[model samples]
Target: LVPRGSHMNRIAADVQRAFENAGEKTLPIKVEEIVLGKQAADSLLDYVKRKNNQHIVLVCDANTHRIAGIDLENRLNQEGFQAECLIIPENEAGDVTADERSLIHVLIHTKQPTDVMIAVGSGTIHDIVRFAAFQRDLPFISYPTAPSVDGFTSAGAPIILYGTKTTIQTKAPSALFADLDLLKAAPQSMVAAGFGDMLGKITSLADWEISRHLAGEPYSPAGAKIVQEALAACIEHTEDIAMKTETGIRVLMESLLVSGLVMLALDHSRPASGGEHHISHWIEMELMEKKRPQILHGAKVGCAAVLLTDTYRKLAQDDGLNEFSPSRREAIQSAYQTLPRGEVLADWLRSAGGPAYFDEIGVGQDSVKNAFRHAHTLRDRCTGLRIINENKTLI
Candidate 1:
C-alpha cells in the first residue's frame, strides 16, 4: 500500500515540502483545503458554513448549470445560504471562452458585494470565475465537475484578453473538490483529456532541462519530480480512466489537481506545461485568428503531446546531443523515453471520442504549418517547438 493518508494528502505533503525549500519574498500560494469524495458538494457547502461566509456566488456556463449548477443553487437555498448561480450562456461559435466581454458585463451588476464565489465548471469556467473573484476581491472556491484540465487550483487564469489567450496571475482556489460521482458522469473525453494533459510533461520537463543547460534558465528539479510522480501515477491507470472507473477518475483528478498546485508552489507553470502546451496555444490563437470552432484545451494538448514527444525523441539522438554535456543530455533523453510516443496519446483520445489528430479536430495541414511556425512566440518559456522553429522549418 502507499501508506499514510489519501493520495490527495500525499500530494499536499509533497507540495508543502517544496514550499518550505523555496523561501522567497513573494506571497505564498495558499491551498488550505481539498476534499475528494462522493459527497464533494456537501463538503463544499460545509466549507461555506464553517467559514461563516454568506451570499456566496457560484459561476458556470449554461451547460454546467444544467449538469450541476442548478441543483447546487437550489440546495444552497434550502440550507439558507445566500448563494447566486451565474449561469453564463454557452457561446455557440466559440464555446465558453474566458473573455472579458462575456464575463465583465454580467459580473458587473449580477453579484452582490458580499458574495463569495465558487467556480462550477472546468477549464474556461474556472478561469472566468477565478479572474472574477480575484478582481472583485471575493474569496474563491473551486468545485470541479470534471477531470478535464489542470486549471483548477492554479494561481494563474488563462483568459482571452485583447483578442489573445493569456495566463493572468490570479489567486489560487482557497478550497477545491473533485466529487468523484460528478466527475465520472463528466464526458469520457474530458477524463481522457486530463490524462492527455499529464502526458505533455514528458516533453515539457525535457524543455525545462534543455533551457536550464543551454540558456541557464531557472531550474526546479524538486518541483518537476513532484509532477513526474503525479503524472506516472495516472499514466498507470489510463485503462481504468478510459473505462470511467472510479479508481481511474480519482487518480486522474489527483494528477490534474497536483499539476495546478505545483505551479503555485513553484510560482510559475514550469513543472506541468511545456512545448506541447505551446502547440495547443498556437492552435487556439489560430482558432481566434481564423474564427474556427473552439477546441477543448486538454483535447488540443492531447494531440499536441504526441507531436512534441516525437520531436523530443529526435532531438535526443546522437547528432542532437553535441551541444549539451553527456550527464545533462542523459537526463533529457531519458525523460523523452519515459512516456509512450504520440501514438499512445492519439490512441487513448480516439477511444474516448477526443480528437487524435489536427485533421480529426477540423484543422488542415496549412493551419498546422502556421501553428508550428509561430506557436513558439506565444510565451517566453522554452519549448521543443520554440527550439524546433529556431533550427529549421517544421513545415
Candidate 2:
C-alpha cells in the first residue's frame, strides 16, 4: 500500500477499516508514501535491501513511474524479502515510454529475480508492470489509484516502440485494488478523464456486438449489461459529476470498476476500448515518432470518442454512399447498416465536459485528418477499424 498524499492516508485508513469490519483477523496490506522519480526509487531499493525484504509492492505514479521506478534499482533486500516495486505513471508517460526502458535496463543491472510485480497506479503502471513481469515470467497485480483509463485490468499493454503504438500480449494483474477516497480526492481532470474513458465503452461494446454478429467473434451479454448498468448510473449523476460532488465520485467509481470487470469477464478489452482508443494510439505513435510531448491517454481518447460517435452517426444516416461499390455494400450490410446509439454516446460525452472536437485538445484539423487516415493500423484486435479497412469506401 502506498499512501501518496496526506489525503491518501484517510483512504488507506478507510480501506484498512473496511477489511477489519469484514472480521478478517489478518489484513494483508501495508502503506508506503514515497515520492516519485529516480531518487525515490534508489532510496526505496536501498531501504528494502538493507532490511532483507523478500517482496516489494509499489504504487506507481500516474505520470512516469515506469522509467523512474524500474530504472532506479532492481535488487532490494527487506527483512529477507526481495523487493520489486511497480510503477504507474500519470498522463501520457506510461510503461512503454523511454522511462520504462530505463527501468528495464536498471533491473537488468541488478540481476535480481522478481517474484511478483504489483502496480498500484492506473493505466500506464498496469501496462508497464504487466509487460515487464510478463517478460520476466512473473505474475503481476494492480492497485489502481485512479480511474483515468480503461486499461487498468486489460490483458495487454499498449506500447510505443520506434514510431508505432502497438498492443502487446501480457498477463493481467492477479488482483486489483481501488481506493475510492483517494480516487475522489484526485484532480477533477482525472475524474473527468475516467468518465471520458468509460464513455468509449458505449461505442466499443457496440462495435463488439456488430463484430459478433458478422465476424463470429464471441460476445458476452453479461459483460455488456454490466457496462450498460454502470454507464446508466453514471449518466443519471451527470450533474453531480459536473459539480464534482461526492455522489459524482461514487457514480464514477462504480462505472470505472464495472468497466474493468467487464473486460475481465469478457477476457478481452474489446468491451471497454475500440476505435476511439485506436485513434488515440495512432496519435500517440505520431507524437512519439516526432519526439513531441505526449498527451494524456484518456484526454486523447476522450476526444476520439467524440469523433468516433459523430462519425458513426454520420455514416449511419448516409447509406446512399454504399452504392459506389460491392465492398461497401458488404461492409455496411455486415453491421446491418445502422448505428448503435452512437449519437447518444456523443451526447453523453458532451454532457460530461469532454472535448467534442479535436481542436479542443490542441490538435489541428490536419492532424485529425491524418489520424483518421491511419488510425486503422493502431490495433490488430478485431474492431471497427478492421471492418473499415476491409472496405476502402468507408475511409
Candidate 3:
C-alpha cells in the first residue's frame, strides 16, 4: 500500500539507498510510512484504516493528551474504530519517566488485546508504548507531539532499569505522523530542544569515525553521510527554527525523521548518539537520583555537545593526532574536520534558545566532572569521551 501523502517519501527512498550502499539486502527499517504536514493526523487515521486495525489503544500523558491525543482518539472513535485512551499519570515532578514503575503501570492498563496502539508524545511516551506494544507483539503508530529526541523511529527503547539508563531493543513504530501545525505550536522550549538534539549529531557522527579509526570498529560511511546531510540541511534554517516558521518546523521535523530512519535501518543508535548522549544520560540519571524535575533530553544533549566540542578542539591541537599512522590520522582528522569550536557551538545553541552549558540545564560543574570521569562506562562503545578518559589530564 502506498503512503497517503508524498511527504517524507524522499527519506524512505534515502533509507533504501543507504541500506543498498551498506551492502545489505534485508532492509532493517520497521516503520512503513511517515506522514509529515499540516493535519498529518488525518494520515494516521488513513494508515490505521488501511492496515485494517480496529481496536486502538492511544497512550499519552496529560500534557500530550491535551495537545493531540484527545483529538486523535475522538477521530478514531468517530470513524467506527474502537478507541480507548490511557493517560499515564505524572510523577511528583509533573512529568513521566520511562522507568520500571511507569512501565508496569502501562502494561497493567494495556493488558487486553488491541489491534494497534498509538504513542502521542515525545521520547518518554514513545519508549513506554514501544516496549509495552513489543511485549504484546502489537504494532504501534507514532504520533509525535513535539519534534524532540530522534527516538521516534528507533527500535531501541532507552528505559531506566536499576537506576541506570539501558536501551532495550524493540520494534519501531509501524508508522509515524508528524503534524507541522501541532509541531510549530509546541512550546518554544521544546522546539529549541529539537534543534539541540539535531546539533548533537555533529559530535556523534564524529565519534563514529573515532571508533572506527581507534578501536577498529565497523563503520559505514554511507550511513554517516545520511545523518550528516540531514544535519547540514537543518542547520541552514537556524533563523527559521528560532522564529518557529512553517519552513523551519518542516525542515526540522523532516531532519529528525531522516536521522531516525538511519538508526532504524542500522538497528542501532550509534549513528546519532555518542559522547554527547552519554554525558546527557549521566546528567539525567543524576537528576533522577536527586528527585529533581527532568530537563528536556535534547536540551541536555545540545549542552553536552557544546561541552564535548572543547574536548574535540583540544584533540585537534594535540600531538596525538599526528602520532597515529597516516591512515589512522586521516580517519581521526575527518572526525574533527567538521566540528565547530566549543564556543561557536555554544553561541549557536544560544541563538536557538537552547542550553549552551550544563549549568544552564541545572547541572553543576561537579556533576559534569563526574560524568566526564564515568559516562563512557555507561555504554560499551569507543568515543572521544573514552579517549579523554584514557588520558587523565584531558579534562
The candidate that wins on TM-score is 3
Candidate 3 deviates by what RMSD?
Answer: 2.2
The C-alpha TM-scores of every prediction are 0.89, 0.69, 0.93
- Per residue, candidate 3 scores C-alpha lDDT tens digits across 1-395 of 44432344656776676768778653555577788888887878778878898889999888888888889999999999988778889877787989888888878777576778899999999999999899888998899999887889878788888877788998888888888999999888898999999999989988988888788876777788788888987789888888889999898988888888877666667878889999888888898888788999999998899878778767756777565588766766667877888888778778777888887778999889888789998988888888768764455
Candidate 1 stretches with Cα past 4 Å from truth are 1-10, 18-27, 92-94, 318-339, 351-353, 392-395
Q: How accurate is candidate 1 locally (lDDT)?
A: 0.75
Better of 1 and 2 by TM-score: 1
**Scored by CA lDDT, what does every candidate get?**
0.75, 0.59, 0.83
Error of 3 at 44 (Å): 1.4
lDDT of 1 by residue, 1-395 (tens): 32222343556656665656764332344666788778877877777887788787888777788887888888889899877778776566837778887678547655565558888988778888888888888878888878988888887888887777777887888878667899989898788778778777766777887677666777776677778888788777767887888888888888888778777766777667788888788888888898877877787787887777776777666465556577756765765666567787677666655678878778778877777678788878766566567763332
Model with the higher TM-score, candidate 2 or 3: 3
Q: How many pairs collide in each candidate, listed in order?
A: 0, 27, 0
Root-mean-square deviation (CA) per prediction = 3.8, 9.3, 2.2
